[PDB]
PDB file of C-alpha atoms and ligand atoms in Angstrom:
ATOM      1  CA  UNK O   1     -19.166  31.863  16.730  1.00 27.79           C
ATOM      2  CA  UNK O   2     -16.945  29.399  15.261  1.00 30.01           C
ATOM      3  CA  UNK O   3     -13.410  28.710  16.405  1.00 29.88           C
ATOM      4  CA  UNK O   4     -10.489  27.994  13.922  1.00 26.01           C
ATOM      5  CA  UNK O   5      -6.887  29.623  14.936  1.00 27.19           C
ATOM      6  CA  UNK O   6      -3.785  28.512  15.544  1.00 26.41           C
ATOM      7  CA  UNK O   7      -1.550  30.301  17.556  1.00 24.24           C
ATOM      8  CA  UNK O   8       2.093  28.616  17.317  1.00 24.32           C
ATOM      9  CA  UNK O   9       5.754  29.745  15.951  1.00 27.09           C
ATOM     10  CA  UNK O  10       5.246  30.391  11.994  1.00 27.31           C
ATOM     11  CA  UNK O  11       8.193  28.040  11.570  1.00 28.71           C
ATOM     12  CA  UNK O  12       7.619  24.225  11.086  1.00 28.51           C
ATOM     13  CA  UNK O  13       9.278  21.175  12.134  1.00 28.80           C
ATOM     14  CA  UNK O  14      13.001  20.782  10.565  1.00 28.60           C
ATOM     15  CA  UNK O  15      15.756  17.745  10.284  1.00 28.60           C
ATOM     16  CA  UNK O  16      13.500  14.881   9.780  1.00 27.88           C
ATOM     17  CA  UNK O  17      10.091  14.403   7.511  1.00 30.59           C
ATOM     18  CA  UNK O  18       7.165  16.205   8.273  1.00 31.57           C
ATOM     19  CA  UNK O  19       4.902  13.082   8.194  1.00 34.24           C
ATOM     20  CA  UNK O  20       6.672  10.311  10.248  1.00 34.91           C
ATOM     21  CA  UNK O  21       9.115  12.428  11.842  1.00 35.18           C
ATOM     22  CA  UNK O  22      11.835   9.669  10.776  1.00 37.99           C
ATOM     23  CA  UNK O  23      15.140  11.643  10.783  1.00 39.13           C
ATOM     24  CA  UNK O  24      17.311  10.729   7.513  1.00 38.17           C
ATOM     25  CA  UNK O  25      20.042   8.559   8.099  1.00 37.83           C
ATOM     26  CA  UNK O  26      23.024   8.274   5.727  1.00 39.43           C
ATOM     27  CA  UNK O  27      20.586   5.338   3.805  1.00 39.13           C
ATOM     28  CA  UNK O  28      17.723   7.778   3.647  1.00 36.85           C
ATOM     29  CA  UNK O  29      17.529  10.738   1.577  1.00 36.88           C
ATOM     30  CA  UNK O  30      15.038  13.770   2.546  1.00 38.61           C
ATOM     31  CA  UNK O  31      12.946  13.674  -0.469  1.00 38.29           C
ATOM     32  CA  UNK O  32      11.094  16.920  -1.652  1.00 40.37           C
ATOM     33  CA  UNK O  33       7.175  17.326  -2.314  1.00 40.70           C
ATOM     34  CA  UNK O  34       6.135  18.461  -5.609  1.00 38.62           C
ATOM     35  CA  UNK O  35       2.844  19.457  -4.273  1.00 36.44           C
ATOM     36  CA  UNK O  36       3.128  21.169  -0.854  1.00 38.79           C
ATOM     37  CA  UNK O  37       7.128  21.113  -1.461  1.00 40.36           C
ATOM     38  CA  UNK O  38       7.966  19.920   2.203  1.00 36.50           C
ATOM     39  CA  UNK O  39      10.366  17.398   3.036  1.00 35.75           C
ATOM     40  CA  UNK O  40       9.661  13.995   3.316  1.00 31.25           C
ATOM     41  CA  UNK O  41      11.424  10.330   3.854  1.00 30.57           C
ATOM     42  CA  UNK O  42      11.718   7.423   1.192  1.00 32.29           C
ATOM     43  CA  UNK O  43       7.975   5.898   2.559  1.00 30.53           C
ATOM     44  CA  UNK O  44       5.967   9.315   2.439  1.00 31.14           C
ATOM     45  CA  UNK O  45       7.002  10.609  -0.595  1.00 33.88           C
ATOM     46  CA  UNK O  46       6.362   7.162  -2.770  1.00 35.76           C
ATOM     47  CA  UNK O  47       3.143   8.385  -3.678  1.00 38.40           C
ATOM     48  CA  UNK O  48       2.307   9.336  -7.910  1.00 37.20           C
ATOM     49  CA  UNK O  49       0.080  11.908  -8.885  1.00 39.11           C
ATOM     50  CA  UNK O  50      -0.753  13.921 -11.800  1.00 41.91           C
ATOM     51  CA  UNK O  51       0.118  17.444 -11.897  1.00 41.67           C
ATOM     52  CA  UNK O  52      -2.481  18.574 -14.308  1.00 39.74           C
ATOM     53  CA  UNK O  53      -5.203  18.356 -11.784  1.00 35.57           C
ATOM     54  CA  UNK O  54      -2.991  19.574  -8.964  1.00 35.22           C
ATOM     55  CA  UNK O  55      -3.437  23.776  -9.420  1.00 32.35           C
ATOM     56  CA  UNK O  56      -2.452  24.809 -13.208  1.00 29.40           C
ATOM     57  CA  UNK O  57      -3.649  22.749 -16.099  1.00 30.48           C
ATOM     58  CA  UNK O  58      -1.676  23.228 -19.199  1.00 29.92           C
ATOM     59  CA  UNK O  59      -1.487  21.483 -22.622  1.00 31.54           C
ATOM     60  CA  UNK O  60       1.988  19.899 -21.843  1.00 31.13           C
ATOM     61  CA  UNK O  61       1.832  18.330 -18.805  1.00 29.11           C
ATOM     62  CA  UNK O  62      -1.325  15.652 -19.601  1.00 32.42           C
ATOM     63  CA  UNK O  63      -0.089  12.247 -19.186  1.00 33.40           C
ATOM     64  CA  UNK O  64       2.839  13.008 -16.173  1.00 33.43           C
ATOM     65  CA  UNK O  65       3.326  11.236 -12.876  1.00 35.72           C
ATOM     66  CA  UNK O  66       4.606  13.423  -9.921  1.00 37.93           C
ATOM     67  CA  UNK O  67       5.835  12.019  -6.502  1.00 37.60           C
ATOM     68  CA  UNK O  68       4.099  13.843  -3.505  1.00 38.52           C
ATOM     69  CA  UNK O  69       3.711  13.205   0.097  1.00 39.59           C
ATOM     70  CA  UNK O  70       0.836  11.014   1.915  1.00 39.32           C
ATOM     71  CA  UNK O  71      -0.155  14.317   3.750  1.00 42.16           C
ATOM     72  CA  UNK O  72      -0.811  15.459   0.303  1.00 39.42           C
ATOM     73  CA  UNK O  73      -1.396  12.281  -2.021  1.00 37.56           C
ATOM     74  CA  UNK O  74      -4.363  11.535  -0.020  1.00 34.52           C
ATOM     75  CA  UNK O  75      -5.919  15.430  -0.224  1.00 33.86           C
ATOM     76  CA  UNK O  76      -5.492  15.330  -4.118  1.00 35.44           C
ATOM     77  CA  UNK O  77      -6.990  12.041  -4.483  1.00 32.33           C
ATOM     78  CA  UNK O  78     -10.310  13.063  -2.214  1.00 35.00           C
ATOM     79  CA  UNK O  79     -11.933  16.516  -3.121  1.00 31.94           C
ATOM     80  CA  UNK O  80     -13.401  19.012  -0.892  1.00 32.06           C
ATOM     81  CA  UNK O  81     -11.801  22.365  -0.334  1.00 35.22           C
ATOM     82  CA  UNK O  82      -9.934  24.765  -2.265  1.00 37.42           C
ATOM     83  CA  UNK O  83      -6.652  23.195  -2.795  1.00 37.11           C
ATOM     84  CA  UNK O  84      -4.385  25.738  -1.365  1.00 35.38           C
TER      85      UNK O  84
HETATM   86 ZN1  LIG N 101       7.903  10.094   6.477  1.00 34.84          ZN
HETATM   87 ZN1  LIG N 102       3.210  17.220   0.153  1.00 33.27          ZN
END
């Protein structure tokens, strides 16, 4: 018997960044994810990461630098299970 379920609204949290919760004022700009593709503020989304390793390798994109959010920078760079 192992328990894993989460039973809450399918929606998720809107308005402000989905790591610090810091709502975007007129100076900050709700970035975008290039991983998950959530939003995110100028502090969580500051983090480069190749795309090649990230779910589709292709011979074009070899050498590239994405921006991505802590939530995710920090599941790329660590391995374990199935990116998804
Ligand atoms: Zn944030
Ligand atoms: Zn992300």
């Amino acid at each position: 018997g192992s328990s894993g379920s989460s039973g809450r609204y399918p929606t998720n949290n809107f308005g402000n960044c989905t790591g610090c919760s810091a709502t975007f004022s007129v100076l900050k700009k709700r970035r975008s994810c290039s991983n998950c593709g959530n939003s995110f503020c100028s502090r969580c989304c500051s983090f480069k990461v190749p795309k090649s390793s990230m779910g589709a390798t292709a011979p074009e994109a070899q050498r590239e630098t994405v921006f991505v959010c802590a939530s995710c920078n920090q599941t790329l760079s660590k391995s374990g299970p199935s990116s998804g």
